[PDB]
Amino acid sequence: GSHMMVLVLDISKWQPTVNYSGLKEDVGFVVIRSSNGTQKYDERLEQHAKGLDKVGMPFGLYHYALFEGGQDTINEANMLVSAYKKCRQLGAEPTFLFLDYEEVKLKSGNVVNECQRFIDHVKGQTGVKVGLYAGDSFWKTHDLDKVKHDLRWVARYGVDNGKPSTKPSIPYDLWQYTSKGRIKAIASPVDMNTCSSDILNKLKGS
Numbered sequence: 734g735s736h737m738m739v740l741v742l743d744i745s746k747w748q749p750t751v752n753y754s755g756l757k758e759d760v761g762f763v764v765i766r767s768s769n770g771t772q773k774y775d776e777r778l779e780q781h782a783k784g785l786d787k788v789g790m791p792f793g794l795y796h797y798a799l800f801e802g803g804q805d806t807i808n809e810a811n812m813l814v815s816a817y818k819k820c821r822q823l824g825a826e827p828t829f830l831f832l833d834y835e836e837v838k839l840k841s842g843n844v845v846n847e848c849q850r851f852i853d854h855v856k857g858q859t860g861v862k863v864g865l866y867a868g869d870s871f872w873k874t875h876d877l878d879k880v881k882h883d884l885r886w887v888a889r890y891g892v893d894n895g896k897p898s899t900k901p902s903i904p905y906d907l908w909q910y911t912s913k914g915r916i917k918a919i920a921s922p923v924d925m926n927t928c929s930s931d932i933l934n935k936l937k938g939s
Contacts, residue, residue, distance in 0.1 A: 738897070739933055741907060741926040742914070743795065746776040748921050753784035755918030762936045763792045764831060764926075767816035770799030770838075771808050774816060779823060786825035791937045793829035794820070795866060800851065802842040810854035817859055828938035830855055831886060833866045834877070844875045852882050862935075866909075869901045878903075884935065886926075897927065906932045 740759050744751060745766035756763065763785055766775040778794075785792040796813040800806040813830060820827050832851050839847060852863045864884030867877055872887060888909035891898025897910045907928045914925035928936075 734930065739927050739930065741928060741933070741936070742916075743909070743924045743926065744777075744781060744919070748781075748919050748923060749777060750920065751781065751784060752918035753788045753790060756790055756916075757788055759916070760790065761933045763790055764795050764829070765792060766833075767794040767796045768809075768812040769797045771805070771812055772799065774812070774819070778816060779819065782820040782825040782827070783823055786823070791828055792825075793827050793831065793936065795831035795833045798832055798834045798848075798851065799836075799838045800847060802839045802847055806847050806850050807854055810851045810858070813855050814858045817861065827861070829884065829936050830859070830861050830863045831866050831884070832863065832882070834875075835867050835871055837875075845877065845879045848877070848880045852880065856883075862938075864906070869903060872903060884932070895925070907936070 743764040765781040800809040862883035866886035868888040886907040887901040887905035889901040914923040
């Protein structure tokens with residue numbers, strides 16, 4: 734344990750410049766955005782993967798879901814798999830993957846079932862653990878407890894002032910506690926997360 738709270742960041746193209754070495758002191762893990770649906774890979778995916786690999790920061794990937802159901806769900810799962818492969822092509826080694834499911838684009842069907850199809854596909858293709866992210870309220874109102882996956886990543890921001898505020902109303906493994914973090918290494922607001930030491934170990938690949 735520590736007098737300092739465990740700190741995990743998540744970043745995307747919205748953090749176009751990051752002093753990666755400047756994260757090493759306080760940050761235990763970083764999750765980077767892989768892709769938005771089948772529309773695009775995140776524009777900073779490779780930059781961030783290379784930057785984190787450079788300094789030996791353990792990291793993972795999250796996919797922002799936009800799937801329609803059916804084959805599109807699988808095609809989106811393949812975006813995340815492809816992003817994972819792209820990182821490995823650059824020599825980097827992500828240790829955890831995530832489905833970020835916080836809006837619904839399904840033409841028909843059930844959110845739990847389609848999230849499950851996505852997660853099963855990614856796990857089956859890669860052998861890497863795959864967790865699930867959503868805000869507290871969205872998670873409850875879409876029955877996300879019924880999805881089987883490897884890590885509950887739950888957002889609840891409270892006053893959203895860069896420091897921990899209101900906790901999620903449901904159990905969590907990783908808690909995204911603000912979207913307005915301030916750290917010297919990143920000019921832009923950044924999402925900040927915390928978790929137990931056991932969950933940090935899990936993120937890092939056990």
